[PDB]
Write a protein that binds this ligand. Sequence first.
Ligand SMILES: [Mg+2]
Ligand SMILES: [Mg+2]
Ligand SMILES: [Mg+2]
Lengths: 377, 262
Amino acid sequence: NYGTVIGIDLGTTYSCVAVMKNGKTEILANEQGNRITPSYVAFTDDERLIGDAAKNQVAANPQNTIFDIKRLIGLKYNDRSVQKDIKHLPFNVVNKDGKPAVEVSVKGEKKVFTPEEISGMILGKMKQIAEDYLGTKVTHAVVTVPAYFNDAQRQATKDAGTIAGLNVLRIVNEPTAAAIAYGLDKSDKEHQIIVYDLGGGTFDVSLLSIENGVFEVQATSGDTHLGGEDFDYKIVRQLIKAFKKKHGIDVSDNNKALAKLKREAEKAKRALSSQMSTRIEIDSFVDGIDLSETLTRAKFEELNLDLFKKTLKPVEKVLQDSGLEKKDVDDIVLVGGSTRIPKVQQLLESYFDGKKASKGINPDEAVAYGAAVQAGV
Amino acid sequence: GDYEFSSDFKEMRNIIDSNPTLSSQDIARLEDSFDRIMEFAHDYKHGYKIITHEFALLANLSLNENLPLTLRELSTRVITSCLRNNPPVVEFINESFPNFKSKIMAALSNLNDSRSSNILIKRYLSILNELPVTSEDLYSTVVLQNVYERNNKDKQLQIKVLELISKILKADMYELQEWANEFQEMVQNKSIDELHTRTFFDTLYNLKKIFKSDITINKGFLNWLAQQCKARQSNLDNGLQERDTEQDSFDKKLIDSRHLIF
Ligand SMILES: [Mg+2]
Ligand SMILES: [Mg+2]
Ligand SMILES: [Mg+2]
């Protein structure tokens, strides 16, 4: 009666869908060939764009394009974090019955959608990726949320599923899913797992216990404004300054210039994960002027050291709170693509006196993978 | 195919398929198609998808000499943006399209038989520099030295030529004086960045380690080497713990070079 039930990682910046097929779990690529899908929704006169299509047309439609809705879901309009988060948003957020809701213009009339509905639009796209891949309709899913999410936030996630046409049979904690993806649940004596989850815009760490095969979340800590994008931004800002000093032109307001820069900065960061220095170049960048600049891994790490270091304070807090000593940690699980940054790995390992983190599943896909594993009832 | 840009290239493809000779109105649309998508070519994912779907087309428009320079520049510029810091694009092209390097060098020399035109020259140099250069591809020393000479007005272009020469020497033997003379002049250029300084340095270091007295190192370079020695030793000689490992080693290697190689 459950059909083929799917696993979905519904992230702040990216979402990912997986399914257990013939006892193997497969991560499923979207219509654009991508295994991970931006958590974006865009409203145009003619279209409701979701995912890749939505994030591509962000530039010239910066206020009908919804992102980071996960920051609002299940929360109250008066909540401190909603107030703070609202400022840094380029789209309109209104109070509807005490809950935050987004207001867009199509057209040119005002339309309002809850965080449940925007989430449901994202979930619907993930479902349809699974339906294209399977031969049929799916009606049930396992969906993941951060471990600190409260009851309101979990119900709102299940409600978003209903709106996508999904019965969410279970809401699973994200750090647990990743632990399951690593088969850390085959204990076999009580184990203490630390999950270190550095996403695109948020940072989570969780101390889990596992005994007999029952997970239990011991502590959580983290930073809602610390992620991969922050590191990229430090490169971008370094580039903007370099170009200004050299040619007198400030590109901070030039959107086309910015779009090109953010993308090259992301390519640079990726290179510095394997090389010690790189060149960043853009032909006809502005006003007939070519951009050409160097970045070393040392400079990149220096730019980001306070940020990289702030990730350890939550690790300690999670040990203090639980009462554990470092030596009592059996497994360190890395979630989120930014965990591939050598300095990030080095700091954590060094913090655990040299012990190796479990990395072997793509860290962007581990959550969805564990979700799909559960969904295999 | 599809592919989130199948649209724009479906368009471009039949506009060119609608008439053997593109009209002013046809190339103006092609241009505008190029203006819109340029920004996505820089994307790690988009750049790869674009090359794997449209490369045949891109290279045709870049290399068609009957077309106007501005149009060729636009297609060429999509390629360069897809290539930079994009290993999977580099591997793709160099493997599925092994003759492209040679075609590119061909256009380079035909451009230099003119006009400027310097812009497309630079795009081609950029491409040749992103693609591997092996013993196989051995690229005229005369054309390159001609382009180099013709353009003292364009240091950015010279810099790109000298970068390519560093790669050709590497592929040949193993891993003439006029070139060692160009490197020595340019290496002292104050506007050159540290990564180009290293590349030019290493080329000279290697040449001098290999041919010894048969390559002449000039006085000015030796003066620059001395100034660079004190500045960079003074860099090794502070704190704190941090360090740029790669920078430190290069400094040591250049300091030692004096008592030995130079
Ligand atoms: Mg089957
Ligand atoms: Mg500042
Ligand atoms: Mg002399």
